[PDB]
Design a protein around this ligand. Structure first.
Ligand code: MET
Ligand code: MET
Lengths: 397, 392
């Protein structure tokens, strides 16, 4: 019993931070689709530029619809404070622009989302910030790479595109010892499956464009961490260095999506578990990577830090670059698209799609096979998804 | 070649291409799918025209961008999540450590903050110069000068730049001229036609016109815009504009001409009034004969705009009393809305500063700025009148 008990995840996803009685009984929070806020007095106005008063002035810095979204994402991640941005890249760039100056070093996971890699190497890397890639699964190697200039450790777990994982608590422990800020891109899991801040990370970023929205109709990013770090990112990264302002309309849609997060994630995971087990037994499949199978290289780390194994599958077809094209073109229910976490099931074959400008030789040493297909398993009836994949495997043979 | 108002309503869109829809459907979608991997292939290389991901390209955003490009008379447009998004995406693309950016003497506050505390701390060099003083500008040019950036007119005294003269100087040195054209809009001033390479807008202001969206625009040559899209936007800021907000912005642009006409007509009346009030020490409105750059104003701007800055004799105290008395004008930052807005920096935005810190940025103790809106002028006059009375 007792009132000091934390409400369950689904309760907070739906209610946290909002009481209808503070807004004329409105069951759904009204949408503050306004660019600016006014003051009753110039002295009240002075107080919102001098930090004496809680309030609002300009939606780029702060907005009540965005604030609700932010406090709710903070609650779900177990962090102190949230920030909502125009995209995942908005969240990532606003964060790193704030935390890094010339001479600082960022240690990076070995593989990264493509635009993240490009921001680092062709963006902030070109402004005097040093980059080093390390296998975050090898704690001994991470420890060895730390220098007094190391300011930020940044990685995804599971990471694009191989679902390589890092031990978050282990990384946090090394960073505590040396003094570095740990940021985890937690897009693939959501706070429903994994909570890096509870494992000792300082900040988490999300492409809310993916599972958090869940419906493929908005682009959005989220940062969650300590009040001090999130405030700094808000007032420097967002306000001055990116201008990546989330529309209140889209923030409201994001909050709508978050109300079913637990139910969608349950189904994404149950469907992908069924597909992965089916695919592991098909003749055309040479290799499958799914965190829910014992064949997964980091099976125990997955079980240890993710409450469920996710909705992403990667597998290799027998027949190389060819067989991929044939599998892909055959799909009738899965769509050929590069994204993830939609209600609609998506499939990509990077060899003949994203990385098709390269030759057979070149995709290696970036972690990309010739028959590597990636699946974002959606919310459709599993039997239809099974049938679609089955029929497409046949055509790929 | 259709007129401005025709283009603001129609340019880039034929209903017959979208099932007869008079108003273009809103592409509120994050991702786009491909009929084949082959069609897919020719999008991540980029020589077959289509779509892949709303962060790079999207048809609602594309229409907005074409429309804005047509109105400014430029080759290409880019739509971003805010004015700051447009400015940072631009400058992050164009500058690297060791490059220098030449700046107008005063700038929008968050632009100043970005330059001085953001990109400036990454080894990019900054120098402020008066962009109306062509010889000070020429003398300020160095081999490192890669970008010239300013607003015209500029806060807080509505100081103008000689856009054409700046551009002549810039091309001797190959430098890129970027003009923040927020205050005028393409309806009143077109910097690309005066020789600028790129224009940026806080579309949050006049372009939207209705105070309900945050948005930015860049317009310029295809090659520069392409790079700002693929580098500044995609990689360095992630300032993605919602398709919902883009559609609202296009809705607002359909009345740009009509709104700007009323903003200016209202502001001209208010300026004439203010200019002869005894409480008012000094006034800055491009439409007054007393405006120091009256002539340059009229060469660049087809109308004198909807913004007024003036200085009350009684200093900071008069400013506070003026501001607090306003009943129709709202005390708020921002501008370019239907609703009239006013601010007094010395007691609002820059209050925590000191008298000489404020003077250093050209912020007078009695300086108030009016964003004159669309309300009946007799009502706006009455509000200003009683506020002036209260200011004593
Ligand atoms: C390239 S847009 C983002 C889509 C998805 N996250 C991917 O891996 O490609
Ligand atoms: C300090 S919030 C941004 C400033 C406001 N847009 C202005 O016109 O002054």
């Amino acid at each position: 019993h007792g009132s000091n008990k934390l409400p369950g995840f689904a309760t907070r996803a739906i209610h946290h931070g909002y009481d209808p009685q503070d807004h004329g009984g409105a069951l759904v929070p009204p949408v503050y689709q306004t660019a600016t806020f006014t003051f009753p007095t110039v002295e009240y106005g002075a107080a919102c530029f001098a930090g004496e008063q809680a309030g609002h002035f300009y939606s780029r810095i702060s907005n009540p619809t965005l604030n609700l979204l932010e406090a709710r994402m903070a609650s779900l991640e177990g962090g102190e404070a949230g920030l909502a941005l125009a995209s995942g890249m908005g969240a990532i760039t606003s964060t790193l622009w704030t935390l890094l100056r010339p001479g600082d070093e960022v240690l990076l996971g070995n593989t990264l989302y493509g635009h993240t890699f490009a921001f680092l190497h062709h963006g902030i890397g070109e402004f005097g910030v040093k980059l080093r890639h390390v296998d975050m699964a090898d704690l001994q190697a991470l420890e060895a790479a730390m220098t007094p200039a190391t300011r930020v450790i940044y990685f995804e777990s599971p990471a694009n595109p191989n679902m390589h994982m890092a031990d978050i608590a282990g990384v946090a422990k090394i960073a505590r010892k040396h003094g570095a800020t740990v940021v985890v891109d937690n897009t693939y899991c959501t706070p429903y499956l994994q909570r890096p801040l509870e494992l000792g990370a300082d900040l988490v970023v999300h492409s809310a464009t993916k599972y958090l929205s869940g419906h493929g109709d908005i682009t959005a990013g989220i940062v969650v961490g300590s009040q001090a770090l999130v405030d700094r990112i808000r007032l420097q990264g967002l306000k001055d260095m990116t201008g990546a302002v989330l529309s209140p309309h889209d923030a409201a849609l994001l909050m709508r999506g978050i109300k079913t997060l637990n139910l969608r994630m349950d189904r994404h995971c149950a469907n992908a578990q069924v597909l992965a087990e089916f695919l592991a037994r098909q003749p055309q499949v040479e290799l499958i990577h799914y965190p829910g199978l014992a064949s997964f290289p980091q099976y125990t780390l997955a079980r240890q830090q993710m409450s469920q194994p996710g909705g992403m599958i990667a597998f290799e077809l027998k027949g190389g670059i060819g067989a991929g094209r044939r599998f892909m073109n055959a799909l009738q229910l899965f769509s050929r698209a590069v994204s993830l976490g939609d209600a609609e099931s998506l499939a990509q074959h990077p060899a003949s799609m994203t990385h098709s400008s390269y030759t057979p030789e070149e995709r290696a040493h970036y972690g990309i096979s010739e028959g590597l297909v990636r699946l974002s398993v959606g919310l459709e009836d599993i039997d239809d998804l099974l049938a679609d994949v089955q029929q497409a495997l046949k055509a790929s043979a």
